[PDB]
Design an enzyme around this catalytic site. Structure first.
Site, PDB file in Angstrom:
ATOM      1  N   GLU B 208      52.292  45.094   0.533  1.00 19.03           N
ATOM      2  CA  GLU B 208      52.036  44.778   2.436  1.00 19.03           C
ATOM      3  C   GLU B 208      50.618  44.505   1.849  1.00 19.03           C
ATOM      4  O   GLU B 208      50.049  44.907   1.264  1.00 19.03           O
ATOM      5  CB  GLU B 208      52.443  45.638   3.436  1.00 19.03           C
ATOM      6  CG  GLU B 208      51.956  45.274   4.304  1.00 19.03           C
ATOM      7  CD  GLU B 208      50.809  45.951   5.342  1.00 19.03           C
ATOM      8  OE1 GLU B 208      50.686  46.658   4.460  1.00 19.03           O
ATOM      9  OE2 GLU B 208      50.495  45.187   5.991  1.00 19.03           O
ATOM     10  N   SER B 209      50.613  43.646   2.618  1.00 20.33           N
ATOM     11  CA  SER B 209      48.922  43.112   3.229  1.00 20.33           C
ATOM     12  C   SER B 209      47.756  42.875   1.980  1.00 20.33           C
ATOM     13  O   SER B 209      48.235  41.631   0.917  1.00 20.33           O
ATOM     14  CB  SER B 209      48.079  44.136   3.643  1.00 20.33           C
ATOM     15  OG  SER B 209      46.816  43.584   4.243  1.00 20.33           O
ATOM     16  N   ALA B 210      47.333  43.562   0.871  1.00 20.60           N
ATOM     17  CA  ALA B 210      46.272  43.238   0.080  1.00 20.60           C
ATOM     18  C   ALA B 210      47.126  43.862  -1.178  1.00 20.60           C
ATOM     19  O   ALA B 210      47.033  43.333  -2.316  1.00 20.60           O
ATOM     20  CB  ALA B 210      45.894  44.351  -0.033  1.00 20.60           C
ATOM     21  N   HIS B 454      49.096  43.387  12.256  1.00 19.18           N
ATOM     22  CA  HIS B 454      49.508  43.273  11.077  1.00 19.18           C
ATOM     23  C   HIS B 454      49.218  44.994  10.749  1.00 19.18           C
ATOM     24  O   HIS B 454      48.710  45.955  11.343  1.00 19.18           O
ATOM     25  CB  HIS B 454      47.413  43.094  10.251  1.00 19.18           C
ATOM     26  CG  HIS B 454      47.806  43.160   8.830  1.00 19.18           C
ATOM     27  ND1 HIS B 454      48.297  42.085   8.066  1.00 19.18           N
ATOM     28  CD2 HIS B 454      47.224  43.990   8.351  1.00 19.18           C
ATOM     29  CE1 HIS B 454      48.436  42.237   7.372  1.00 19.18           C
ATOM     30  NE2 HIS B 454      47.448  43.262   6.716  1.00 19.18           N
TER      31      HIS B 454
END
Ligand code: 7P9
Ligand code: 7P9
Ligand code: NAG
Ligand code: NAG
Ligand code: NAG
Lengths: 537, 538
Positions: B208-210, B454
Site C-alpha cells: 500500500e502506498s510506498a 489515503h
C-alpha cells in the site's frame, strides 16, 4: 476472579488481579444529561442495584484540541475526534460521573484503611481517571506495610464543567467540575467504609489542574469542607498547581467565552440561551464548547476553561481566600517539576522579547495589570540564555531565541513561584498547620523540556523508571496518607523538613535528594508576591 | 502458550501458535546492516544462524516520523525527542532490522505447499515497519474461505538508511537499498519458504502506498529480471494506491542536495570519502542527520526527500520509461485507489490556494523539468468550483480552506489515481495479454474533510474493520487472486470483476455494495498527465 461490594446505594462487581481488587466506573452521581447538563451533580436518590465494574470506566467529554481556533491541522483533528465513532471508541460521554476504587486483595467492610483520593489534571479541558491506575502505587503501599484505598474520580472538564458568564452564575451553575469533585468526596464519606476505608482519613491528591482543584476543595464554600458534621479530607498533596488568581465567573473573559459557545451551539437570540444549550444534541454541543482556544495552542496557559470566583462555591480570588483564612487548612505536601513552563512555551514561539511577552500578557492573560507592572515583572527575568528553563543547562535547550526565558516565566508565575507565595501566605495565616514542599529534578538533561510538566505522572504516579526518586517520593506520600506526616510510618532516607521552619525544600534527583533553600529567583518571586492581585486571569 | 519449531536451510526458528494461527516474528533474512554494512546493499547470511526465538515482537528499521531540522517548531521538537536512545529502544527500532514475519495456519508443515502473500508496508519511504501489519485477520478469512496461504510481512530500510542518493552512493553501487532489501527478502522466500509450508512458485506481492510503488519497482527491478536461480520471484502483484513514480536520477540535483545536507549535519563534510565517513557516525547522530531534511508531514508533503530513483542498474530508468520500453516483469495484477487519495497531503500546504500558487509550489518543490506553461495547463484542467474537488462528490462540503478540495484532487490524481490509469493504459499496450483488474474504494464516503482517504484500506481491507460488504468482497477477491491468479476464481464472488483492458471498466466498492463503472472520470486531467508524463519526474 470477581468480587462483590454491597453499600448503602447499590452494589458492585470488581476484579481481583495480582493482589488488587479494582472497581472501575462506580456511579457517584446522576448522569449530567438532558435536564442535568450544565447543572450541579445530583446524588442517587434510589438504590442503583448491581453494576459490573470489571470493565473500563467512561470519560467525560474531552477537549484535546480546539475545533475553531489554532492551526488548521489541529482544528481538523479537533473536529475529527468529536465524531460519534471516536467518542464511542474512547468510551467518552456526558454519562461520566463515575469513579474507580482499587484496594489490596481481601480487604473487607471490616477494614479501616486510609483513603487516597486522586484528581487528574488536563487544564480543566481534558483528562479522565481511565489512564490513572493505582496498581503500582497500591502495590508499594502494601510492600511498605501501609495499605490504603485508592479512589480516582471523573469530573466535568471544558464547557461541561467550567462554562461561565452571567447566565450560568444566576442559574447557580458555576464551577460544575469542582462540585463534581465535591460530591465525589461526599459519596466517599457515605459509601467508602463499605469498601473498607476510613472516611476520616481521606487525603486528596492532584496534578496540574487536579492540584489546583485540591486547593480549590480546601477553599470550597469559604473553607467549609464539612459533610454531615465531619471534614471531607484530612490532608492534601499538590503536584504543580495551587492558587490561581482569577476574575469572577461573570467577568469579561467568561462572558465572551459563553457568548461564543452560544453562537456556535446555534442558540443566539433565544429567550433562555442557557436553557437552549441543554436542547442541543451532544456532538453539536461538544463541537461548540470545544470551539474556543485550547491549551494546545498559541493561547497556551491563558485557559478558556478554569475555576472562577462565583461567590458561593468559589467565594473569591484564591489568593484572597488564603489571605482571609477562608479555606480548610490541612497538613499538605506541595511540589513542582523543576521545568514546569517548558511545555507551555513551545507553541507561543513568536513571543521573543520583553515587549512581546508583555503584549502577549496584555492580549490574553492579565487584564488588570498595566504595561508598566508586567514590564517590571518580565524584566526580573534575564535575557541570558543560561538563566532560563530547563534550568542549569547553560546555552543549551534554546528551542527559539527567548524560549527558556518565556518557559521560566510561564512556569514560575503559574506553578513554581506561585507555590512559594502560597506557602508563604499559608505559613502566615495558619502557622500551626504543617506543610512540606519539594522540587523534582530526576529528568535533568532531557533535551529542550528538562524535568517538565507532568513528568511526575510517569516517575511518581507510575514509578517509571524505578529509582531513588520513585522510592523516596512514593514512600513520603504513602507515609503522609497513613500518618499525616511524610516522615512518619515507613523509615525514610532523608528527614523532610517542614517548609515554615527555614523555608527549605527537598530537591529530588534520579539518584538522590538534597535539602535546599526555597529562595531561587528571588526578585521574580518578590514582585509576584507583592503584586499577586494583578495576575488574575 | 504453545510453541512450534521450523527448521529451514539457514537456521531454526521457534514461533507461537494462537487460535489456529502460527506466527514467527523477527525471522532474520539478511545480515544486520550495521557498521561497515550501513549504507550497503543487504547480504545473505553465509552461515547458519542457529535456533532463534521468534515468539515475541520483531524490530523496526529506523524511523523518520517527523523532520528534526525542517518544518514547524513543535514538529522539529518532537522529531528530535523521538530519536533519543530511550525511545528508540522502547519501540524496538534500530539498524538491526532486516527481519520478516511469517504467519500460517496451525498444523502447516513443509509439505503443505500453500500460496504465499508477501506484504510490503507503506510509509512514504521514510517510515513504516511490519510490526503493526499482523496478518491474523486476513489469514483467518483465507482459512474460512478454504483458501489458506502463508502471510509474509517484511521490514525494509527507509529514509536515509534505505534511499539516500547522490553520486557517491551511486558510484558505491549503494542506490535504492530499500528496494534491495525487499528483493533480498523475496530471494530468502524463494530459498526458504517451502520449509514453512509455502509454494515459492505461488508468491503474490502486495503493498500500500510506498509499498505499492515498491511492488511495481520489484516488477521493474534489474530491467524486469525477477528471476532467481532460474525461477520467477513472484507470479502476481497487488497495488493499493501507487505504482509508477516518474523520478529524476539518483545522482540528480535533488538527491545530491539531500546527500550534501545529510553529510554536513552528520559532521562528515570535507572528509576524503564522505560516504565512508557516514558509516562511522554514531547511530543517534546519523539518525538526526538523515531525519534533518524535509519530511512528508510538512509543507513539502509529497515532494519526498527519500524515494527510489533511477540508478541505471537496479532501477534502470524512470519508471514510466521502464513500462513503455517493456522492461518490467509483467505479471497478472490488481491495482486500486482510495477515492480521495490527496486529501491527507493537502492539509499542511494550506497557503497553496490559487492556480498561480499551485504552479509555484510545483515548480519550487516538485517538478524541475516542467515549464510554467505546462504546469498551468495541467492545473487548469481542474475547476476551482468547490464541488469539483476531493473529497469527490461531496458538493459544497469539506472545504478545509479555500482551494483545499482542488489541491487535494490534483495531488491525489497525479501521484496515485490518474497515474494508475496511465499505468494500466501503458501496460495494456506493451503487454496486452497480461490481465489486470482495477478498482476505486469509496467505502468511507462522507467522512468529514478527508473522504475515503489515503491508507483507509489498511483498516477496511487489511484488518477488515468494520466487517461489511467492502471487507468481505475485497478480501475474497484478493485471497482468490493469491490462490488462483484471478480475483474471480476460487470462492464464489458476488460481482464478476472485469479485466481492465476489455472495456476500461473498474469496480467501485462502497461500504454496502459494489458497481462496475468506467475508468474515465476527470478525462482532461488524465489526458494531460498521460501525454506529458515525463515532465512530472519528481
Ligand atoms: C516510552 C516512554 C518511557 C519513558 C520512561 C521514563 C523515564 C523517567 C525516569 O524514571 O527515568 C530517568 C530519566 O529519563 C530520562 O530523563 C527521559 C525521560 C523522559 C520522560 C518523558 C518521556 C532515568 O534516566 P537516568 O537518569 O539515566 O537514570
Ligand atoms: C476504531 C475506529 C476505526 C475503524 C474504522 C473503520 C473503517 C472502514 C469503514 O468500515 O468504516 C466506516 C466508518 O465511518 C467512516 O466512514 C470511516 C471511519 C474513518 C476511519 C479512519 C481512522 C464505515 O462506515 P459505515 O458505512 O457506517 O459502516
Ligand atoms: C504571534 O502569533 C499569534 C498566532 O499564533 C498571533 O495571534 C500574534 O499576534 C503574533 N504575535 C507576534 C508578536 O508575532
Ligand atoms: C529533465 O529532462 C532531461 C532531458 O531533457 C533529463 O536529462 C533530466 O534528467 C531531466 N531532469 C529531471 C528532473 O528529471
Ligand atoms: C507557504 O508557506 C510556506 C511555509 O510558511 C512558505 O515557505 C512558502 O513560501 C509559502 N508558499 C506560498 C506563499 O506560495
Amino acid at each position: 476472579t470477581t468480587v462483590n461490594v454491597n453499600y448503602p446505594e447499590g452494589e458492585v462487581v470488581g476484579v481481583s488481579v495480582l493482589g488488587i481488587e479494582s472497581f472501575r466506573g462506580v456511579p457517584f452521581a446522576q448522569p449530567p444529561v438532558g435536564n442535568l447538563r450544565l447543572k450541579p451533580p445530583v446524588r442517587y436518590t434510589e438504590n442503583i442495584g448491581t453494576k459490573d465494574t470489571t470493565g473500563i470506566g467512561p470519560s467525560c467529554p474531552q477537549m484535546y484540541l480546539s475545533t475553531g481556533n489554532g492551526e488548521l491541522l489541529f482544528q481538523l483533528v479537533g473536529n475529527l475526534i468529536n465524531i460519534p465513532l471516536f467518542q464511542t471508541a474512547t468510551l467518552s460521554s456526558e454519562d461520566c460521573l463515575t469513579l474507580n476504587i482499587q484496594r489490596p486483595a481481601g480487604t473487607t467492610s471490616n477494614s479501616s484503611l486510609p483513603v487516597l483520593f486522586w484528581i487528574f489534571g488536563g487544564g480543566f479541558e481534558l483528562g479522565t481517571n481511565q489512564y490513572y491506575d493505582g496498581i503500582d502505587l497500591l502495590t508499594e503501599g502494601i510492600s511498605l506495610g501501609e495499605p490504603f484505598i485508592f479512589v480516582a474520580i471523573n469530573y466535568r472538564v471544558g464547557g461541561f464543567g467550567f462554562l461561565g458568564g452571567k447566565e450560568i452564575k444566576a442559574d447557580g451553575s458555576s464551577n460544575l467540575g469542582l462540585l463534581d469533585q465535591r460530591i465525589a468526596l461526599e459519596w466517599v464519606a457515605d459509601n467508602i467504609a463499605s469498601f473498607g476505608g476510613d472516611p476520616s482519613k481521606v487525603t486528596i491528591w492532584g496534578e496540574s489542574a487536579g492540584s489546583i482543584s485540591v486547593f480549590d476543595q480546601m477553599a470550597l464554600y469559604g473553607g467549609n469542607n464539612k459533610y454531615k458534621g465531619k471534614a471531607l479530607f484530612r490532608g492534601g498533596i499538590m503536584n504543580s498547581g495551587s492558587v490561581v488568581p482569577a476574575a469572577p465567573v461573570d467577568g469579561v473573559k467568561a462572558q465572551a467565552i459563553y457568548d461564543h459557545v452560544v453562537s456556535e451551539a446555534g442558540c443566539a437570540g433565544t429567550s433562555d440561551t442557557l436553557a437552549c444549550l441543554r436542547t442541543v444534541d451532544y456532538t453539536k454541543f461538544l463541537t461548540a464548547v470545544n470551539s474556543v482556544p485550547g491549551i494546545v495552542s498559541y493561547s497556551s496557559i491563558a485557559l478558556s476553561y478554569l475555576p472562577r470566583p462565583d461567590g458561593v462555591v468559589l467565594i473569591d480570588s484564591p489568593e484572597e481566600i488564603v489571605k482571609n483564612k477562608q479555606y480548610a487548612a490541612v497538613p499538605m505536601i506541595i511540589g513542582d517539576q523543576e521545568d514546569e513552563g517548558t511545555l507551555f512555551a513551545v507553541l507561543p514561539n513568536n513571543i521573543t522579547s520583553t515587549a512581546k511577552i508583555v503584549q502577549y500578557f496584555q492580549d490574553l492573560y492579565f487584564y488588570n495589570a498595566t504595561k508598566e507592572q508586567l514590564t517590571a515583572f518580565v524584566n526580573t527575568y534575564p535575557t541570558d540564555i543560561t538563566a532560563g528553563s530547563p534550568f542549569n543547562t547553560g546555552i543549551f535547550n534554546e528551542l527559539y531565541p527567548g524560549f527558556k526565558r518565556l518557559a521560566a516565566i510561564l512556569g514560575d508565575m503559574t506553578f513554581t513561584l506561585a507555590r512559594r507565595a502560597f506557602l508563604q501566605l499559608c505559613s502566615e495565616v495558619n502557622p500551626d498547620v504543617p506543610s512540606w514542599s519539594y522540587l523534582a529534578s530526576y529528568d535533568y538533561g532531557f533535551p529542550f523540556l528538562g524535568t517538565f510538566h507532568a513528568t511526575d505522572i510517569l516517575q511518581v504516579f507510575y514509578g517509571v523508571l524505578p529509582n531513588y526518586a520513585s522510592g523516596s517520593i512514593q514512600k513520603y506520600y504513602i507515609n503522609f496518607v497513613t500518618t499525616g506526616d511524610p516522615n512518619k510510618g515507613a523509615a525514610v532516607d532523608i528527614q523532610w523538613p517542614q517548609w515554615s521552619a527555614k523555608k527549605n525544600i527537598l530537591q529530588i534527583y534520579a539518584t538522590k535528594a538534597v535539602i535546599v533553600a526555597d529562595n531561587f529567583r528571588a526578585k521574580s518571586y518578590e514582585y509576584l508576591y507583592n503584586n499577586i492581585g494583578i495576575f488574575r486571569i
